[PDB]
């Protein structure tokens, strides 16, 4: 109840007071941010992904690579909205944390048709998929 790590996924900009609710992007069917033809990332923004086993937040590849558990903990850090989905693939790596996806939502009023998550970089060492989503919802307007 009102606990952002499981109830709701909205975070408030303490500067303007703008509440950023990304429940609009809660397409649990899986937004597909491709990596290569045939295999991309099936992610849901706050909402257990129904395309894969329910509970997963993002899926990578064609097989069953989990890019983290579906967290609802929308954060606001470095003037961007950040969603980190940890505990998916237990990757044997340098640190080998988990194949966590870090979705960084960046303000962009012109992100109407370009309102999609884009994989910026793939760090295999810390197993982190860096996504940038251009969204007007992440805009700190008054």
PDB file of C-alpha atoms in Angstrom:
ATOM      1  CA  UNK A   1       0.000   0.000   0.000  1.00  0.00           C
ATOM      2  CA  UNK A   2       1.717   3.120  -1.355  1.00  0.00           C
ATOM      3  CA  UNK A   3       5.020   1.285  -1.408  1.00  0.00           C
ATOM      4  CA  UNK A   4       6.825   2.155  -4.625  1.00  0.00           C
ATOM      5  CA  UNK A   5       8.897  -0.983  -4.756  1.00  0.00           C
ATOM      6  CA  UNK A   6       5.721  -3.015  -5.494  1.00  0.00           C
ATOM      7  CA  UNK A   7       2.532  -0.895  -5.586  1.00  0.00           C
ATOM      8  CA  UNK A   8       2.853   2.072  -7.865  1.00  0.00           C
ATOM      9  CA  UNK A   9       5.371   3.347 -10.296  1.00  0.00           C
ATOM     10  CA  UNK A  10       5.302   7.049 -10.126  1.00  0.00           C
ATOM     11  CA  UNK A  11       7.959   9.357  -8.840  1.00  0.00           C
ATOM     12  CA  UNK A  12       7.816  13.058  -8.159  1.00  0.00           C
ATOM     13  CA  UNK A  13      10.294  15.712  -9.230  1.00  0.00           C
ATOM     14  CA  UNK A  14      10.955  17.572  -5.965  1.00  0.00           C
ATOM     15  CA  UNK A  15      11.915  20.669  -7.941  1.00  0.00           C
ATOM     16  CA  UNK A  16       8.749  21.373  -9.961  1.00  0.00           C
ATOM     17  CA  UNK A  17       6.509  18.986  -8.084  1.00  0.00           C
ATOM     18  CA  UNK A  18       5.716  17.108 -11.281  1.00  0.00           C
ATOM     19  CA  UNK A  19       4.691  13.577 -10.602  1.00  0.00           C
ATOM     20  CA  UNK A  20       5.917  11.257 -13.299  1.00  0.00           C
ATOM     21  CA  UNK A  21       3.572   8.309 -13.660  1.00  0.00           C
ATOM     22  CA  UNK A  22       4.743   5.811 -16.206  1.00  0.00           C
ATOM     23  CA  UNK A  23       1.758   3.472 -15.831  1.00  0.00           C
ATOM     24  CA  UNK A  24       0.904   4.534 -19.381  1.00  0.00           C
ATOM     25  CA  UNK A  25       3.971   2.566 -20.536  1.00  0.00           C
ATOM     26  CA  UNK A  26       2.905  -0.474 -18.548  1.00  0.00           C
ATOM     27  CA  UNK A  27       2.513  -2.513 -21.720  1.00  0.00           C
ATOM     28  CA  UNK A  28       3.129  -5.869 -20.083  1.00  0.00           C
ATOM     29  CA  UNK A  29       2.700  -7.453 -23.492  1.00  0.00           C
ATOM     30  CA  UNK A  30       6.308  -6.469 -24.049  1.00  0.00           C
ATOM     31  CA  UNK A  31       7.754  -3.503 -25.868  1.00  0.00           C
ATOM     32  CA  UNK A  32      10.310  -4.890 -28.183  1.00  0.00           C
ATOM     33  CA  UNK A  33      13.646  -3.108 -28.321  1.00  0.00           C
ATOM     34  CA  UNK A  34      15.611  -5.157 -30.821  1.00  0.00           C
ATOM     35  CA  UNK A  35      19.327  -5.884 -30.634  1.00  0.00           C
ATOM     36  CA  UNK A  36      19.610  -7.768 -33.882  1.00  0.00           C
ATOM     37  CA  UNK A  37      17.082  -9.064 -36.386  1.00  0.00           C
ATOM     38  CA  UNK A  38      15.123 -11.726 -34.654  1.00  0.00           C
ATOM     39  CA  UNK A  39      16.189 -11.055 -31.121  1.00  0.00           C
ATOM     40  CA  UNK A  40      15.594  -8.061 -29.018  1.00  0.00           C
ATOM     41  CA  UNK A  41      14.396  -7.049 -25.639  1.00  0.00           C
ATOM     42  CA  UNK A  42      10.806  -7.559 -24.625  1.00  0.00           C
ATOM     43  CA  UNK A  43      10.325  -5.133 -21.776  1.00  0.00           C
ATOM     44  CA  UNK A  44       7.408  -3.849 -19.848  1.00  0.00           C
ATOM     45  CA  UNK A  45       7.531  -0.559 -17.964  1.00  0.00           C
ATOM     46  CA  UNK A  46       6.112  -1.403 -14.538  1.00  0.00           C
ATOM     47  CA  UNK A  47       4.080  -4.495 -14.974  1.00  0.00           C
ATOM     48  CA  UNK A  48       4.974  -8.107 -15.023  1.00  0.00           C
ATOM     49  CA  UNK A  49       5.575  -9.108 -18.647  1.00  0.00           C
ATOM     50  CA  UNK A  50       2.826 -11.442 -19.857  1.00  0.00           C
ATOM     51  CA  UNK A  51       4.760 -12.422 -23.028  1.00  0.00           C
ATOM     52  CA  UNK A  52       7.238 -14.281 -20.934  1.00  0.00           C
ATOM     53  CA  UNK A  53       6.550 -16.056 -17.538  1.00  0.00           C
ATOM     54  CA  UNK A  54       4.629 -13.456 -15.440  1.00  0.00           C
ATOM     55  CA  UNK A  55       6.923 -11.682 -13.080  1.00  0.00           C
ATOM     56  CA  UNK A  56       9.697 -10.963 -15.501  1.00  0.00           C
ATOM     57  CA  UNK A  57      10.228  -7.333 -16.486  1.00  0.00           C
ATOM     58  CA  UNK A  58      12.294  -7.727 -19.588  1.00  0.00           C
ATOM     59  CA  UNK A  59      13.303 -10.594 -21.832  1.00  0.00           C
ATOM     60  CA  UNK A  60      16.359 -10.722 -24.041  1.00  0.00           C
ATOM     61  CA  UNK A  61      17.014 -12.973 -26.941  1.00  0.00           C
ATOM     62  CA  UNK A  62      14.849 -15.548 -28.583  1.00  0.00           C
ATOM     63  CA  UNK A  63      15.192 -18.202 -25.875  1.00  0.00           C
ATOM     64  CA  UNK A  64      14.289 -17.148 -22.298  1.00  0.00           C
ATOM     65  CA  UNK A  65      16.913 -14.668 -21.098  1.00  0.00           C
ATOM     66  CA  UNK A  66      15.458 -12.630 -18.334  1.00  0.00           C
ATOM     67  CA  UNK A  67      16.658  -9.072 -18.084  1.00  0.00           C
ATOM     68  CA  UNK A  68      15.314  -8.763 -14.608  1.00  0.00           C
ATOM     69  CA  UNK A  69      12.284  -9.166 -12.428  1.00  0.00           C
ATOM     70  CA  UNK A  70       9.474  -6.713 -13.072  1.00  0.00           C
ATOM     71  CA  UNK A  71      10.112  -3.930 -10.618  1.00  0.00           C
ATOM     72  CA  UNK A  72       7.649  -1.120 -10.148  1.00  0.00           C
ATOM     73  CA  UNK A  73      10.163   1.059  -8.415  1.00  0.00           C
ATOM     74  CA  UNK A  74      10.355   4.082 -10.647  1.00  0.00           C
ATOM     75  CA  UNK A  75      13.218   6.278  -9.528  1.00  0.00           C
ATOM     76  CA  UNK A  76      14.275   9.761 -10.387  1.00  0.00           C
ATOM     77  CA  UNK A  77      18.016  10.130 -10.576  1.00  0.00           C
ATOM     78  CA  UNK A  78      20.301  12.498 -12.491  1.00  0.00           C
ATOM     79  CA  UNK A  79      17.226  14.290 -13.882  1.00  0.00           C
ATOM     80  CA  UNK A  80      16.062  11.068 -15.552  1.00  0.00           C
ATOM     81  CA  UNK A  81      13.645   8.393 -14.577  1.00  0.00           C
ATOM     82  CA  UNK A  82      15.327   5.161 -13.831  1.00  0.00           C
ATOM     83  CA  UNK A  83      13.971   1.654 -13.704  1.00  0.00           C
ATOM     84  CA  UNK A  84      16.329  -1.114 -12.854  1.00  0.00           C
ATOM     85  CA  UNK A  85      15.150  -4.679 -13.355  1.00  0.00           C
ATOM     86  CA  UNK A  86      17.495  -6.995 -11.502  1.00  0.00           C
ATOM     87  CA  UNK A  87      17.584 -10.738 -10.966  1.00  0.00           C
ATOM     88  CA  UNK A  88      16.935 -12.224 -14.350  1.00  0.00           C
ATOM     89  CA  UNK A  89      19.917 -13.970 -15.826  1.00  0.00           C
ATOM     90  CA  UNK A  90      22.511 -15.099 -13.192  1.00  0.00           C
ATOM     91  CA  UNK A  91      25.324 -14.338 -15.677  1.00  0.00           C
ATOM     92  CA  UNK A  92      28.759 -15.758 -14.806  1.00  0.00           C
ATOM     93  CA  UNK A  93      30.721 -12.584 -15.330  1.00  0.00           C
ATOM     94  CA  UNK A  94      33.289 -10.199 -13.780  1.00  0.00           C
ATOM     95  CA  UNK A  95      30.920  -9.180 -11.065  1.00  0.00           C
ATOM     96  CA  UNK A  96      28.104 -11.423 -12.309  1.00  0.00           C
ATOM     97  CA  UNK A  97      25.355  -9.577 -10.523  1.00  0.00           C
ATOM     98  CA  UNK A  98      22.388 -10.261 -12.707  1.00  0.00           C
ATOM     99  CA  UNK A  99      21.373  -9.326 -16.275  1.00  0.00           C
ATOM    100  CA  UNK A 100      19.710  -6.214 -14.954  1.00  0.00           C
ATOM    101  CA  UNK A 101      18.236  -3.703 -17.307  1.00  0.00           C
ATOM    102  CA  UNK A 102      18.615  -0.052 -16.491  1.00  0.00           C
ATOM    103  CA  UNK A 103      16.033   1.997 -18.243  1.00  0.00           C
ATOM    104  CA  UNK A 104      16.815   5.666 -18.244  1.00  0.00           C
ATOM    105  CA  UNK A 105      13.882   7.813 -19.277  1.00  0.00           C
ATOM    106  CA  UNK A 106      15.012  11.034 -20.814  1.00  0.00           C
ATOM    107  CA  UNK A 107      12.761  14.043 -21.416  1.00  0.00           C
ATOM    108  CA  UNK A 108      11.813  14.550 -25.013  1.00  0.00           C
ATOM    109  CA  UNK A 109       8.574  16.354 -26.010  1.00  0.00           C
ATOM    110  CA  UNK A 110       9.110  15.181 -29.609  1.00  0.00           C
ATOM    111  CA  UNK A 111       9.107  11.581 -28.516  1.00  0.00           C
ATOM    112  CA  UNK A 112       5.648  10.875 -29.811  1.00  0.00           C
ATOM    113  CA  UNK A 113       6.365   8.227 -32.501  1.00  0.00           C
ATOM    114  CA  UNK A 114       9.898   7.788 -31.190  1.00  0.00           C
ATOM    115  CA  UNK A 115       8.545   6.746 -27.800  1.00  0.00           C
ATOM    116  CA  UNK A 116      10.451   3.496 -27.674  1.00  0.00           C
ATOM    117  CA  UNK A 117      13.316   2.115 -25.540  1.00  0.00           C
ATOM    118  CA  UNK A 118      16.664   2.027 -27.217  1.00  0.00           C
ATOM    119  CA  UNK A 119      19.580  -0.066 -26.068  1.00  0.00           C
ATOM    120  CA  UNK A 120      22.469   2.321 -25.723  1.00  0.00           C
ATOM    121  CA  UNK A 121      25.168  -0.027 -24.606  1.00  0.00           C
ATOM    122  CA  UNK A 122      25.473  -3.546 -23.303  1.00  0.00           C
ATOM    123  CA  UNK A 123      27.924  -3.960 -20.480  1.00  0.00           C
ATOM    124  CA  UNK A 124      28.624  -7.658 -20.218  1.00  0.00           C
ATOM    125  CA  UNK A 125      30.778  -7.237 -17.092  1.00  0.00           C
ATOM    126  CA  UNK A 126      28.195  -5.800 -14.809  1.00  0.00           C
ATOM    127  CA  UNK A 127      25.523  -7.487 -16.997  1.00  0.00           C
ATOM    128  CA  UNK A 128      23.685  -4.287 -17.503  1.00  0.00           C
ATOM    129  CA  UNK A 129      21.532  -3.387 -20.436  1.00  0.00           C
ATOM    130  CA  UNK A 130      21.485   0.382 -20.688  1.00  0.00           C
ATOM    131  CA  UNK A 131      18.285   1.651 -22.202  1.00  0.00           C
ATOM    132  CA  UNK A 132      17.287   5.135 -22.989  1.00  0.00           C
ATOM    133  CA  UNK A 133      13.659   5.918 -23.514  1.00  0.00           C
ATOM    134  CA  UNK A 134      12.768   9.274 -24.957  1.00  0.00           C
ATOM    135  CA  UNK A 135       9.630  10.301 -23.209  1.00  0.00           C
ATOM    136  CA  UNK A 136       7.781  13.610 -22.652  1.00  0.00           C
ATOM    137  CA  UNK A 137       6.555  12.157 -19.362  1.00  0.00           C
ATOM    138  CA  UNK A 138      10.071  12.451 -17.943  1.00  0.00           C
ATOM    139  CA  UNK A 139      10.004  16.158 -18.576  1.00  0.00           C
ATOM    140  CA  UNK A 140      10.189  18.236 -15.490  1.00  0.00           C
ATOM    141  CA  UNK A 141       7.672  20.836 -16.366  1.00  0.00           C
ATOM    142  CA  UNK A 142       5.933  23.005 -13.875  1.00  0.00           C
TER     143      UNK A 142
END
